[PDB]
Design an enzyme around this catalytic site. Structure first.
Site, PDB file in Angstrom:
ATOM      1  N   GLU A  49      57.395  69.704  71.940  1.00 49.66           N
ATOM      2  CA  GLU A  49      58.309  67.997  71.767  1.00 49.66           C
ATOM      3  C   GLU A  49      59.004  67.390  73.051  1.00 49.66           C
ATOM      4  O   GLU A  49      59.974  68.753  73.204  1.00 49.66           O
ATOM      5  CB  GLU A  49      59.069  68.516  70.232  1.00 49.66           C
ATOM      6  CG  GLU A  49      58.840  67.089  69.458  1.00 49.66           C
ATOM      7  CD  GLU A  49      58.091  66.043  68.841  1.00 49.66           C
ATOM      8  OE1 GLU A  49      56.921  66.991  68.454  1.00 49.66           O
ATOM      9  OE2 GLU A  49      58.036  65.039  68.514  1.00 49.66           O
ATOM     10  N   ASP A  60      70.676  62.654  67.644  1.00 47.98           N
ATOM     11  CA  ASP A  60      71.214  63.979  67.859  1.00 47.98           C
ATOM     12  C   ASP A  60      72.419  64.192  68.523  1.00 47.98           C
ATOM     13  O   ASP A  60      73.782  63.363  67.806  1.00 47.98           O
ATOM     14  CB  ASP A  60      70.351  63.866  69.660  1.00 47.98           C
ATOM     15  CG  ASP A  60      68.974  63.510  70.017  1.00 47.98           C
ATOM     16  OD1 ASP A  60      68.779  65.032  69.051  1.00 47.98           O
ATOM     17  OD2 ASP A  60      68.049  62.830  70.226  1.00 47.98           O
ATOM     18  N   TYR A 175      57.328  66.794  59.526  1.00 44.38           N
ATOM     19  CA  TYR A 175      58.076  66.567  60.217  1.00 44.38           C
ATOM     20  C   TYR A 175      58.781  67.725  58.445  1.00 44.38           C
ATOM     21  O   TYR A 175      59.486  66.610  58.235  1.00 44.38           O
ATOM     22  CB  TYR A 175      58.411  66.433  61.211  1.00 44.38           C
ATOM     23  CG  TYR A 175      60.027  66.695  61.651  1.00 44.38           C
ATOM     24  CD1 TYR A 175      61.290  66.639  61.278  1.00 44.38           C
ATOM     25  CD2 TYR A 175      60.443  66.621  63.702  1.00 44.38           C
ATOM     26  CE1 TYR A 175      62.536  67.940  61.757  1.00 44.38           C
ATOM     27  CE2 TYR A 175      60.906  67.548  64.280  1.00 44.38           C
ATOM     28  CZ  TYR A 175      61.703  67.882  63.174  1.00 44.38           C
ATOM     29  OH  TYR A 175      62.941  68.231  64.453  1.00 44.38           O
TER      30      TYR A 175
HETATM   31  O1  LIG Z   1      66.449  71.610  66.223  1.00 48.77           O
HETATM   32  P1  LIG Z   1      67.190  71.106  66.208  1.00 48.77           P
HETATM   33  O2  LIG Z   1      68.448  71.492  65.800  1.00 48.77           O
HETATM   34  O3  LIG Z   1      67.658  69.963  67.772  1.00 48.77           O
HETATM   35  O4  LIG Z   1      66.299  69.519  66.318  1.00 48.77           O
HETATM   36  C1  LIG Z   1      65.267  69.553  66.984  1.00 48.77           C
HETATM   37  C2  LIG Z   1      65.901  68.108  67.425  1.00 48.77           C
HETATM   38  N1  LIG Z   1      63.909  67.776  67.855  1.00 48.77           N
HETATM   39  S1  LIG Z   1      62.756  66.758  67.357  1.00 48.77           S
HETATM   40  O5  LIG Z   1      62.611  66.812  68.589  1.00 48.77           O
HETATM   41  O6  LIG Z   1      61.903  68.018  66.996  1.00 48.77           O
HETATM   42  C3  LIG Z   1      63.711  64.976  66.477  1.00 48.77           C
HETATM   43  C4  LIG Z   1      62.630  64.978  65.197  1.00 48.77           C
HETATM   44  C5  LIG Z   1      63.674  64.253  64.441  1.00 48.77           C
HETATM   45  C6  LIG Z   1      64.805  63.886  64.547  1.00 48.77           C
HETATM   46  O7  LIG Z   1      65.254  62.494  64.148  1.00 48.77           O
HETATM   47  C7  LIG Z   1      64.882  61.793  62.948  1.00 48.77           C
HETATM   48  F1  LIG Z   1      64.345  63.317  62.078  1.00 48.77           F
HETATM   49  F2  LIG Z   1      65.529  61.289  62.107  1.00 48.77           F
HETATM   50  F3  LIG Z   1      63.465  61.181  63.295  1.00 48.77           F
HETATM   51  C8  LIG Z   1      65.631  64.073  66.018  1.00 48.77           C
HETATM   52  C9  LIG Z   1      64.829  64.793  67.153  1.00 48.77           C
END
Ligand SMILES: O=P(O)(O)OCCNS(=O)(=O)c1ccc(OC(F)(F)F)cc1
Ligand SMILES: Cc1ncc(COP(=O)(O)O)c(/C=N/[C@@H](CO)C(=O)O)c1O
Ligand SMILES: [Cl-]
Ligand SMILES: [Cl-]
Ligand SMILES: [Cl-]
Ligand SMILES: [Cl-]
Ligand SMILES: [Cs+]
Ligand SMILES: [Cs+]
EC number: 4.2.1.20
Lengths: 268, 396
Positions: A49, A60, A175
């Site tokens: 990703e 984030d 997801y």
């Molecule tokens: O391990 P962490 O806690 O840093 O989480 C991973 C984040 N990376 S990601 O690209 O999957 C990811 C997936 C969804 C996100 O926002 C949303 F849910 F609103 F869509 C943000 C980042």
């Protein structure tokens, strides 16, 4: 999306979950990022990703906020990110590559044009963090027209209608969000997600990857044991980058051992 | 699914992470419910009148228009408790928070006026208030920060991104995405995801409602135009709403032109930006060619929102409302003019609206026109800025 289907079929055959790291493209520079990503793969990442640096990453936490800032400081642009993506795909034929986008970067040069460029460079999926299923239609349409899997979020508080929508419209993977809040390893999910995983399967949803707060081998194992197809880890990975900015060698060493351990944990 | 259309034509929507959709739904339902509830309406009216001091005067400005056929009234939101219009809708949103059983308030602020309004409403109504403010804004708005803190609010500097209002907006949503079961996000303008543009409008609409009754009483007819500055759009839509169906009444919104549109150093995305998707909405944005969000520049701190409410973009699209820009120097002249001619020190934000009215008058001085400017704030807060400019110009 067919890379995901092939991955999941192969992992099923090996009785394994997927381990999927997140990094920001171009953090802490283009060249370093490329080396970082090749290290993740060499150490056993099943898919990637990849974040495109954005001015306002409002889903984030601070770890990934800082990754975006570091990429900005290196002058990384979306065009440069597309070039990086083409090279990553050129190096690795089968690994699914998903992007983590914010809506404005997708909309900026035209939604269709965005997904067309994604197809051209060999991206497999796009998750747009600030587009809920309610707003998803033009994104998911453009994605599918360009052979890109649209990634939908299944929040821990999903009702049945959301489950059915995500099941119908999603491809590649679903997801499975660990918890409310924003990305970050300093906060672990609380709620067991077994029931949501079961319901997604009932509705023939794309296989679930748990994400948010995954920072430990036991959590990877837990995701698999609960019936998810695997787990995504971002902040935990990015912290190793942040920790080791002053030592690229130690950085790759620590990334390797971490990814190696997390992948090992995906074996059922 | 929602009760109400999240879009105004092509603009608006609900571009938040999926996790926040139940929060938006709950808020929409509570609002729709509140609007039908005479108890809610009574409590709101009670706070507006007895706490905030409504109704506000409509002041005729005779000196400033002398020798022209312009009649100019100012709607005196500067007299509202807090010294700006921001107080009106925070009282309504705090009642909604209570309706929903929320006991905590999150707010963003740039100039600090919305933060101060959020803090005072929260103190009065017993809600714990935390305010996000870009670290650069915290640094330059020490007085407002102290006011917020005196009223018991927590003020959290935001160091990410550009450390300004958009960054504070992000931080507020990040917090809310993890606290929505107990906290309400008290957004401070008629922008962001549905239902905020709708709620902020309805909780500001007394401005225009009062203006309409007051002008009918004083002049026996509706205004030829109502004029308001446009930061994110709340005071403007508050003034406009009650007149939208009165199609003889012009609706003019004034964006900051900064150092001049041609310099790119401005805050006029409705007319001079590019439609993007950010902070929960599809709207005109200040943005780079790459789609990175940019800051709005203005001499006036409160016109810093780098986008604009979707209802304004829509009213523009259909030609119901017209949007213009006023430069720093134009606004500054208008500021000085009102001080000297009417003994009213206007907020530099609303000085933009006044500047455009003065232009309408000066350009066509024999044109018979009845104008209302929304004086959305008082300018006590701006006298240091004005002092320093005048000193640099050797005017003092
Ligand atoms: O391990 P962490 O806690 O840093 O989480 C991973 C984040 N990376 S990601 O690209 O999957 C990811 C997936 C969804 C996100 O926002 C949303 F849910 F609103 F869509 C943000 C980042
Ligand atoms: C005195 C005054 N007049 C007008 C505006 C402009 O706001 P709308 O367009 O009416 O919503 C503002 C805004 N201030 C915000 C942003 O910095 C804030 O305080 O946080 C203001 O303080
Ligand atoms: Cl679980
Ligand atoms: Cl599917
Ligand atoms: Cl009245
Ligand atoms: Cl005209
Ligand atoms: Cs006159
Ligand atoms: Cs603006």
């Amino acid at each position: 999306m067919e890379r995901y289907e092939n991955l999941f079929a192969q992992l099923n055959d090996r009785r394994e979950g997927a381990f999927v790291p997140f990094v920001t493209l171009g953090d802490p520079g283009i060249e370093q990022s490329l080396k970082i990503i090749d290290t993740l793969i060499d150490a056993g990442a099943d898919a990637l990703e990849l974040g495109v640096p954005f001015s306002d990453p409002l889903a984030d936490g601070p770890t990934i906020q800082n990754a975006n800032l570091r990429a900005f400081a290196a002058g990384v642009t979306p065009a440069q990110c597309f070039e990086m993506l083409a090279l990553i795909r050129e190096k690795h034929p089968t690994i699914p590559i998903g992007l983590l986008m914010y809506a404005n970067l997708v909309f900026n040069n035209g939604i269709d044009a965005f997904y067309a460029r994604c197809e051209q460079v060999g991206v497999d999926s796009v998750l747009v963090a600030d587009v809920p299923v309610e707003e998803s239609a033009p994104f998911r349409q453009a994605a599918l027209r360009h052979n890109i899997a649209p990634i939908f979020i299944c929040p821990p508080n999903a009702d049945d209608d959301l489950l059915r929508q995500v099941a119908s419209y999603g491809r590649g993977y679903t997801y499975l969000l660990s918890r409310s809040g924003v990305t970050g390893a300093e906060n672990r999910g609380a709620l067991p997600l077994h029931h949501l995983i079961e319901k997604l399967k009932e509705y023939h949803a794309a296989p679930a990857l748990q994400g948010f707060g995954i920072s430990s081998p036991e959590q990877v194992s837990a995701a698999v044991r609960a019936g998810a197809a695997g787990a995504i880890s971002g902040s935990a990975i990015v912290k190793i980058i942040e920790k080791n900015l002053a030592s690229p060698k130690q950085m790759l060493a620590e990334l390797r051992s971490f990814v190696s351990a997390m992948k090992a944990a995906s074996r059922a | 699914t929602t009760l109400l259309n999240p879009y105004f034509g092509e603009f608006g929507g609900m571009y938040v992470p999926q996790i926040l959709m139940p929060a938006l739904n709950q808020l929409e339902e509570a609002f729709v419910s509140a609007q039908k509830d005479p108890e809610f309406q009574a409590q709101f009216a009670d706070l507006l009148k007895n706490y905030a001091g409504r109704p506000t005067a409509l002041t005729k400005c005779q000196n400033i228009t002398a020798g022209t056929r312009t009649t100019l009234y100012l709607k005196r939101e500067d007299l509202l408790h807090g010294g700006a219009h921001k107080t009106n809708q925070v009282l309504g949103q705090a009642l909604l928070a209570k309706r929903m059983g929320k006991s905590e308030i999150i707010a963003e602020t740039g100039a600090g006026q919305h933060g101060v309004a959020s803090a005072l409403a929260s103190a009065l109504l017993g809600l714990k208030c935390r305010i996000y403010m870009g670290a650069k804004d915290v640094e330059r708005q020490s007085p407002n920060v102290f006011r917020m803190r005196l009223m018991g609010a927590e003020v959290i500097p935001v160091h990410s991104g550009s450390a300004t209002l958009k960054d504070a907006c992000n931080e507020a949503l990040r917090d809310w995405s993890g606290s929505y079961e107990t906290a309400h996000y008290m957004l401070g303008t008629a922008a962001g995801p549905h239902p905020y543009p709708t709620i902020v409008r309805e909780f500001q609409r007394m401005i225009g409602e009062e203006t309409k009754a007051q002008i009918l009483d004083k002049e026996g007819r509706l205004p030829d135009a109502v004029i308001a500055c446009v930061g994110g759009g709340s005071n403007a839509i508050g003034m406009f709403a009650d007149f939208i169906n009165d199609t003889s009444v012009g609706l003019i919104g004034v964006e900051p032109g900064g150092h001049g549109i041609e310099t790119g150093e401005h805050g006029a995305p409705l007319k001079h930006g590019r439609v993007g998707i950010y902070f929960g909405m599809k709207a005109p944005m200040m943005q780079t060619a790459d789609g990175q969000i940019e800051e709005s520049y203005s001499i006036s701190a409160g016109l810093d929102f780098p986008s604009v409410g979707p209802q304004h973009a829509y009213l523009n699209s259909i030609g119901r409302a017209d949007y213009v820009s006023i430069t720093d120097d134009e606004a500054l002249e208008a500021f000085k003019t009102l001080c000297r001619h009417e003994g009213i020190i206007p907020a530099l934000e609303s000085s933009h609206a006044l500047a455009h009215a003065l232009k309408m008058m000066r350009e066509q001085p024999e044109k018979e026109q009845l104008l209302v400017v929304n004086l959305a704030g008082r300018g006590d807060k701006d006298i240091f800025t004005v002092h320093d400019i005048l000193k640099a110009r050797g005017e003092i």
